[PDB]
Design a protein around this ligand. Structure first.
Ligand SMILES: C[C@H](OP(=O)(O)O)C(=O)O
Ligand SMILES: C[C@H](OP(=O)(O)O)C(=O)O
Ligand SMILES: C[C@H](OP(=O)(O)O)C(=O)O
Ligand SMILES: C[C@H](OP(=O)(O)O)C(=O)O
Ligand SMILES: [Mn+2]
Ligand SMILES: [Mn+2]
Ligand SMILES: [Mn+2]
Ligand SMILES: [Mn+2]
Lengths: 333, 335, 334, 334
């Protein structure tokens, strides 16, 4: 029997501190999306959260780099709770918290909220992919930035959802490299919509959204990678042609790394080079990172991904120093 | 946030009848048989791109009904009764979302009107098909639907695969808007399995549902960068379907990216399909045709029985096309 | 079983401009009687219980002409009782068992009740009922111009709570053995704001915060002995004033005041008429159990005849209203 | 914005131990009601719970007597969360937990469940008055015995509620002494009913109850006390005449004590004397007891009632020893 959002909000109300961090971080990101600040947003963390203990440890380490680079980078943790599978598979912590096919969703949602509250309370803002239609009411108030995945960008119900989120939202290009669907998606999500959704009390209702002003595109690769300068420039021209923001984000992972975690660094280096030469259209990057590098099918090793392979903590330090140094130069112009 | 009546309210005013229930049951089975190769009739999903007027749709049904009966040994005719439309950016999302066509978004009326029409259609002997786009609306009218599509833009979406996994009707997954067929094959795999996810009950309250899987899914070739209707394309698709361990019987959409911005090309496509059915065409179990009383399209709903969404062929062309397919499939069935 | 929420019935049967206006008006007009601003006599009259809408519509049609005829002396409002409190067990009314066969088709019952109430208000006839259940009122309350809380539930806090949140005037009946203080206590209670659990138009439980009902009053319905007469009214008015609440009250001609003998309602009416002639300043209303055809029956075989408490018939009803109208015309002249 | 029962059941699931205690205690009480065991049920504790700390402390002390006297008495704590007022007033911990007019009902219901779980976990079963229609779904699973109050015994919605409780239920005679309404009530509650109620998920629904076979009456005084032998005998005769159990419970407090806390001991002494002589129709008693005696308007003194005045802990030890000694003799005859 599903507990409604209000049950979880009662046990874990948002705090003054978390509320302020979310509010502030959303604004700060808005400023990047609309070209009012030239810091580089960095969405970085695990492909998926499967352990909260490890995620809290990861956050603790990342928090120090968030503070150290705060003049060059705006660091936000990937705290992904919902995973889109190619066919079937584990859909994430909310759907299957115990990782055993028991689908204890009430526990999952509790655990997700708790972790998010803790993260915000320690000073680390959170980001996630919004995949399910009904789960967001549980934890959305604790999210500073949202992704709509490559597999759902073209979907109208996801564009509808985005249109009503209070956080900035990144739409990824399609799994074969279609960028126009993400540009279309900003157009869609920036408008007001009417559709069916569920309330904080667990009942279905008609909602009227005001539109999300702060959407942007994410280059995640397709058949071929789309990260490089030619690709960014091409994208920016298409964005301007559609009358939407020409500031975009580049995913170092996934189709841009050809599903090879050791290539995220190459992509980061290419981005760094663009930031040095010009790179005026770049406002963010995305990196799949964890305590320990690689991936594993069963959750045997602590702080190691059970979804997409991540770079480890050492490589993570390198990468952030690389980007911070490069962006400091861009901001000096 | 505005008041929404739960499904049970609409089920109370418009309960399914013995007859509609039996037609739905029977038609789902009949389609299952096509999907799994037990019957060589050709499913034909045919009707408007979208329903915007119930009067016209009832009239269209009246005429189509006679052909459904006339061709029942060769074709299994089912009407397109599409209530939910996926836009490229923004636009009118269909009768449920905006029944009045004026931006009033009177969804309670929409859902009532949709159920009423569907009940009337089934009652007169015409089965109905629609695209399932929204997650929460299906509980309102799903019991009146004999076949469902998941659109090109949502086939890759996991929530749509989940929804499909719990529908009691056969379901067609369309290839992607640029021609990706693997996403539809992946989608059958997904939807055929059991899933656990959040959904809303007949009473309007969110809940965890545990679906049993949908064994009757299949692929639809709707074009992409290049059309995928012809024999080479069908054969390539059947090989990929067999490789994935799912049914190699598929459906071909004559409309959309296969007709490539001419409604009248649907006839060319139908002719090509007819030729395949004559030569061999063993992998084809269905086709899809965008048809209305009057041909073409219009931005405003000024002309009766003319589409306000994608352009359709008219009634005359519709008669030609069905006779063509019937004649051709009679031959395939004789071998 | 799957209960439809109030909004489902409100969608099919929205209140009309006309019904809405009649309800609003009639509640005000009654308020005026309760607080002594108008000397017309409220008359709550109709069947003990509604078991057939056809008959009730026919009854209303006839009563409507007397309501118009006597509108300067009487304010006539129909008893349209959907919920019945049993001594032990029994048929609890149309909402609970509409088919009268123990099928308990409550969704139908509530639909039928609302439909009837809408039709009644639409034709010009205001409606009254006893509010017994906690959750049913959300379905039809908007169509009710006056409400009773029964003798068996007046002392109950959940009924006082419910009353506190009704937008219509409410009569509290004295207890089944004649206790009047519980009804006076009940006005105190219901006049204040309350917080308690209730169900929304959407069918979900919720905390409600009521504003209080300023239009409550007492009803004398008999006990071990009848309490209708002048000595009893005077005694009651003194107790009401002592508690700081309205000393205008209503007298039930039926039930314990008639000693469960329908032919005595007329005696009681005559005694009330005499009081209205002599003085009767504390009386603002009466209650009469009336139908098309007099008496009662266990099974619903005869049309327009009660299956609950025995009622007077249409002829006697015409007599009684003329009696009260004539008597009250005199009181108003003073 | 009201949380549904499932939210509280998720945070505070019933334990194996509490579940077993409830199950067992309900059976043991059933046995008393139907004359299969001659122990004396004792419902004892505060008039109302306003502080959980004090209630847990009270329980701790009572638990030792429950164990000491377990062969003669079956002791169960009064843990009353809902209070019926004469007019207006504080309605109990659930309605206003903070005691300040903030009506924080979500907190109240949480606190009530938590306290009840703790009580059952330590070995102390709980009893309460069921007043509200929607609150029971929150805490009912933790209750071993239920009362329907003097003010609501005649009410059909309370008889309906009772008909679906899994615990034995005592119906009190009316505030002026009417016993027949309680006998009628057992008749009613023992039958199946159909009515509207709210689910564990917080949505309204139609419920079909199976009937409660374990109801009995409670003598709690009226205009005059009804505790004595003549009154018991007279009640038993009426009970037998109605075909329901002639084993009853006697409240030492309220009308019987004449609203005087000191008086309860007298009543207990009279009951003890009946148990010695014969007292075959008595299965239970009710006592209003707390740490400290008397009452107070504001919650200034710890463990002292803010509702009806209670006897203190000392007097409580005296009373239980009195009843235990007396009932040991009754049980020896057999
Ligand atoms: C899988 C997902 O990215 P996508 O494949 O949607 O680009 C993710 O962010 O890990
Ligand atoms: C729009 C939809 O088709 P799709 O573009 O998903 O093939 C339809 O059938 O009208
Ligand atoms: C039963 C009820 O009267 P009461 O007994 O509450 O005075 C009625 O008016 O039918
Ligand atoms: C007040 C209530 O009992 P009653 O007055 O119903 O006998 C109680 O037990 O506190
Ligand atoms: Mn990933
Ligand atoms: Mn179309
Ligand atoms: Mn009556
Ligand atoms: Mn008390």
């Amino acid at each position: 029997e599903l507990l409604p959002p209000i049950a979880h909000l009662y046990e874990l109300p948002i705090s003054k501190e978390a509320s302020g961090l979310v509010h502030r971080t959303r604004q700060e990101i808005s400023d990047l999306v609309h070209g009012r600040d030239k810091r580089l947003l960095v969405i970085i963390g695990p492909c998926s959260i499967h352990d909260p203990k490890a995620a809290l440890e990861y956050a603790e380490r990342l928090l120090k780099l968030r503070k150290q680079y705060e003049n060059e980078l705006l660091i936000v943790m990937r705290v992904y709770f919902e995973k889109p599978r190619t066919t079937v598979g584990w859909k994430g912590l909310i759907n299957d918290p115990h990782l055993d096919g028991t689908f204890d969703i009430n526990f999952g949602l509790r655990q997700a909220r708790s972790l998010l509250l803790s993260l915000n309370n320690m000073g680390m803002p959170a980001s996630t992919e919004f995949l399910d239609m009904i789960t967001p009411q549980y934890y959305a108030d604790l999210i500073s930035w949202g992704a709509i995945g490559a597999r759902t960008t073209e979907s109208q119900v996801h564009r509808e959802l985005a249109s009503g989120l209070s956080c900035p939202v990144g739409f990824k290009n399609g799994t074969d490299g279609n960028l126009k669907i993400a540009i279309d998606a900003i157009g869609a999500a920036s408008h007001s919509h009417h559709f069916l959704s569920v309330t904080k009390a667990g009942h279905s209702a008609i909602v009227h959204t005001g539109g999300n002003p702060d959407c942007h595109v994410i280059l995640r690769g397709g058949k071929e990678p789309n990260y490089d300068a030619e690709h960014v420039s091409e994208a920016a021209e298409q964005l301007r042609a559609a009358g939407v923001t020409d500031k975009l984000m580049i995913d170092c992972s996934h189709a841009n790394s050809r599903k090879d975690y050791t290539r995220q660094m190459e992509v980061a280096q290419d981005i760094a080079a663009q930031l040095e030469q010009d790179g005026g259209n770049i406002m963010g990057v995305m990196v799949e990172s964890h305590l320990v590098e690689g991936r594993q099918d069963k959750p045997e090793v602590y702080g190691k991904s059970i979804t997409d392979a991540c770079i480890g903590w050492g490589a993570t330090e390198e990468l952030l120093a690389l980007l911070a140094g490069a962006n400091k130069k861009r901001m000096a112009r």
